[PDB]
Design a binder for this molecule. Structure first.
Ligand code: NA
Length: 129
């Protein structure tokens, strides 16, 4: 599923991401935009052989099991394919664990390089939330 901007914002808000660990909703929408272009089916391979999955590009090195990342962890206790669903519940719940692991949203390279220090509230302007 390719989400609309306000559609995604409303779904992230319903799943409790607005101000989760102090990150306003605009941060999460900005992160999703530059991680996946709002596409739940997005995948990308990393140099070490791991793969990033879904709207928030969650990594198989630590967070999910894709059967092709030997020696890795599955801290969200899910198959990585679950992160590609049109239902974003698994991505949001796993994202909550990542952002809580001490590094905050700096875990997402696109957020640090393209969202951090900008006017992230612009990403929810116009939405009925
Ligand atoms: Na893994």
């Amino acid at each position: 599923k390719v989400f609309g901007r306000c559609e995604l914002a409303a779904a992230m808000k319903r799943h409790g991401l607005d101000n989760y660990r102090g990150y306003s909703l605009g941060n999460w929408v900005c992160a999703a935009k530059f991680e996946s272009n709002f596409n739940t089916q997005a995948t990308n391979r990393n140099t070490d052989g791991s793969t990033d999955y879904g709207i928030l590009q969650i990594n198989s090195r630590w967070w999910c099991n894709d059967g092709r990342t030997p020696g890795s962890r599955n801290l969200c206790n899910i198959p990585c394919s679950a992160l590609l669903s049109s239902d974003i519940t698994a991505s949001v719940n796993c994202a909550k664990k990542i952002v809580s692991d001490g590094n905050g949203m700096n875990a997402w390279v696109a957020w640090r390089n393209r969202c951090k220090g900008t006017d992230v509230q612009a990403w929810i302007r116009g939405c009925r939330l």
